[PDB]
């Protein structure tokens, strides 16, 4: 299938409690593979998946150096953004940044991303053209003029079309036995009576990877979107994910309800009903 690499940066100030913390994590699809935390005793980019451990010291030293520089630049950036919003020195604030690339099954760049938020709201984002910006407000317009003057879009575009695509392809090959393996969900339907009039049908999906999945309930072949309760997909702890969908049905109408499961590990889509 198609694949993605993303780096997630969080920089968090904490006035009176030391300098702002900088954390970076790298993902391929739903697999984390590196982390950096400026609060660590020896801050370094560290492995978090086995297929990255083979990279050499030149790799780890470049990734560590860039992250230590990033620690300082994001500290400066939190001061700058506090000024841009006329904010007190006593408050805690957060810059977030996610960037990376999507490639198709042939490894060709589908698109690149670079987006930033401040205290949880969109701040500035590189446009899909990898050459223009979208500033959310007049404070972010300052960053944009700073970034146009430093031709930042060109440096990000070069990364997104170059290293990002190239290293993602390398990781996918080095970790092909996991990153390129889709595990289908294990499924089952449970029945839990609510009253004498109704019962809950819950359609379970367990042990699947990647996280992308479609679980839906149908009544007489019609989707029950507005009446279906879907939990947020959740991690099991072993790389796989879990999800369930629930629908409340009249007692005795259970057979009119079917659960439909779509996942890329599945040879064919699944249709499930309660087997009493």
């Amino acid at each position: 299938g198609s694949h993605s690499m993303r780096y997630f940066y969080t920089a968090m100030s904490r006035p009176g409690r030391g300098e702002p913390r900088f954390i970076a994590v790298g993902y391929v699809d739903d697999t984390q593979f590196v982390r950096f935390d400026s609060d660590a005793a020896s801050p370094r980019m560290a492995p978090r998946a086995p297929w990255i451990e083979q990279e050499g010291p030149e790799y780890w030293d470049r990734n560590t150096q860039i992250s230590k520089t990033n620690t300082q630049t994001y500290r400066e950036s939190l001061r700058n953004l506090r000024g841009y919003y006329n904010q007190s020195e006593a408050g805690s604030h957060i810059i977030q940044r996610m960037y990376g690339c999507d490639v198709g099954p042939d490894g060709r760049l589908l698109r690149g991303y670079d987006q930033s938020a401040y205290d949880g709201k969109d701040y500035i984002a590189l446009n899909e053209d990898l050459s223009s910006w979208t500033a959310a407000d007049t404070a972010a317009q300052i960053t944009q003029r700073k970034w146009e003057a430093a031709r930042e879009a060109e440096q990000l575009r070069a990364y997104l079309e170059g290293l990002c695509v190239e290293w993602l392809r390398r990781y996918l090959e080095n970790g092909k036995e996991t990153l390129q393996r889709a595990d289908p969900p294990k499924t089952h339907v449970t029945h839990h009576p609510i009253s004498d009039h109704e019962a809950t049908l819950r359609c379970w999906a367990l042990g699947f990877y990647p996280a992308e999945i479609t679980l839906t309930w149908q009544r007489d072949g019609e989707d029950q979107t507005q009446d279906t309760e879907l939990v947020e997909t959740r991690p099991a702890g072993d790389r796989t994910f879990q999800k369930w969908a629930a629908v409340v049905v009249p007692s005795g109408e259970e057979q009119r309800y079917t659960c439909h499961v779509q996942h890329e590990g599945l040879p064919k889509p699944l249709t499930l009903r309660w087997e009493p």
Binding site: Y7, A24, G26, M45, Y59, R62, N63, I66, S67, T69, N70, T73, Y74, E76, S77, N80, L81, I95, Y99, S116, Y123, I124, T143, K146, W147, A150, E152, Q155, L156, Y159, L163, C164, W167
Partner: peptide, 9 residues
């Protein structure tokens, strides 16, 4: 691999 450290905001 990470992107080169960029410009402050």
């Amino acid at each position: 691999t990470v992107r080169a450290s960029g410009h402050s905001y």
